[PDB]
Design a protein around this ligand. Sequence first.
Ligand code: AR6
Length: 415
Amino acid sequence: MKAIPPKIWFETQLKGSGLDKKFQIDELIETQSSVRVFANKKYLPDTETINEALTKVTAVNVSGDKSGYFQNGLPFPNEAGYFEKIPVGHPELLSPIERLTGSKKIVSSHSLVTASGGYPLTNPLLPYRKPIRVSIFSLAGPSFENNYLHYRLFLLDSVQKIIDSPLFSHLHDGLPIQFDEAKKELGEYDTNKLMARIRLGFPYLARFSSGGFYPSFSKSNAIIFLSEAYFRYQLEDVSLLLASVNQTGKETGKAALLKATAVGMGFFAKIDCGYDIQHIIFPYYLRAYKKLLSEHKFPWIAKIEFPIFNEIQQEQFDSIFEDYDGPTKVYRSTRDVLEFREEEIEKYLPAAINPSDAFALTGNEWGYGSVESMIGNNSSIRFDQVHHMNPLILDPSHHVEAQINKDHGVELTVN
Ligand SMILES: Nc1ncnc2c1ncn2[C@@H]1O[C@H](COP(=O)(O)OP(=O)(O)OC[C@H]2O[C@H](O)[C@H](O)[C@@H]2O)[C@@H](O)[C@H]1O
C-alpha cells in the first residue's frame, strides 16, 4: 500500500463519491469565497497557528483515533497510543493539546445544500427540489471518546490524579485540581456547586488506576466531573458561535435561523465508546446558550432551533428555558439540521452547526456515519472548508480574530 499525495487523494474521494458532479463551477466560486475562520485569540493567536490547526489532521477519524485514514490515504497504525504520543511540533499531525486548542475555532461557509437527512438510518434522505444555501458553522465539541483529549480537562480519577494543564488554567480558577483533595472537599456528598460524581442510572462510574472503567459504589476510584470547568469551556464555544453567526447575519443583511445542533452529545459523549454521559453534560451546553442570550444583544439571530430527539434532553431543555425571556427566540424541534422551509429560507439566513472534528478534515467519514459526514454528503462543505479544494481557508484575509471578554462579549477583528 503506497501513500498517494493528499490533494490527489481528496480529489479521488470526491469523484468516487459523485460530489464532483453535484454543483456547478460558478456557484462553488461563491461558496468557496464565503469561507471564514473565526479563531479565538487566546488559543489561535497567529495566522500560522490557525493554518496549522486547519491542516495538520487526519483525513478520516472515528472511535477516538482507533480507526481512520491519514490525508495520504494510508490507514491508521495498529499500535494503540500512537496519537496519544504525537508531540507538539510533529511535522504533520496535531498533538492532543494542539487538538484541544485547535478546537477553539469555527469555520463557516455559505454552502450549497442538495438534500436533508441520511443519518441516522431511520432519518430518510430527502433531496431538495432546488439546491438551497445554508451557512454551515463547523465546531468541534469536547470529545470524550478517548482518555487524552477533553477527558484530561474535565475529569478527575486516580490514574491521572490531577489535571496539569497550562493555557486552560482559567477554566479551573477557584475549582479543585487534585483528585484526593477533590474527594475531601466533596467529603460525604456527590455533587456540589463546582463538581459532581457520575452515575449512569444508579451505580457510579469509576476507573481502576490500571486503566479501565467499572461501576463501583463511589469509593476511592469514583471519577469526579468538573462541572464548572465544562460550563466555562462551553461559554467560550457558544460565545464564539453566536458572535460568528451574528456577524454573518449582519454581513448578509438577514437575521439567522440557527440550527443549534447538539454538538458533542453523540459520539463525543461516550467515554471510551460505551459509557454515555450525554444526560450529564447537555444541561451545561444549554445553560451556555441561556446565559449568553440573556446577557447579550444578537440583532442578526432571529431564532435558534435546537434539534433534540431524546426524551431526557427534551425535558432538560424545557426545564432550563421555562424561565427564559431573552430577546432571541429559542425553541426545540425534531427536524433534521439541514431541513428548512422555503418561507424560512426567504425570511432568514439559514444557519446550522456542523458538529465536527478538530483532528479530521471537514466532512470526515464518507458514509452517512455521523451528523458531520451527513452534512459532508448533503452540501458543498468538502469543497468550501477543506484546504485541498479551497486554499482561501489559509488566506489571512479570510480569518477573523475573536477576543472573548470577561463578560463574554466578543470583539471581531478582520485582519
Ligand atoms: N439528522 C440529525 N439532525 C440534527 N441533529 C442530529 C441528527 N442526528 C443526530 N443528531 C444529534 O447530534 C448529536 C451529535 O451528533 P454526532 O454526529 O454524534 O456529533 P458529536 O459532536 O457527538 O461527535 C463528533 C464526531 O462525530 C463525527 O464523526 C465528527 O467527524 C466527529 O468525529 C447527536 O447526538 C444527535 O442528538
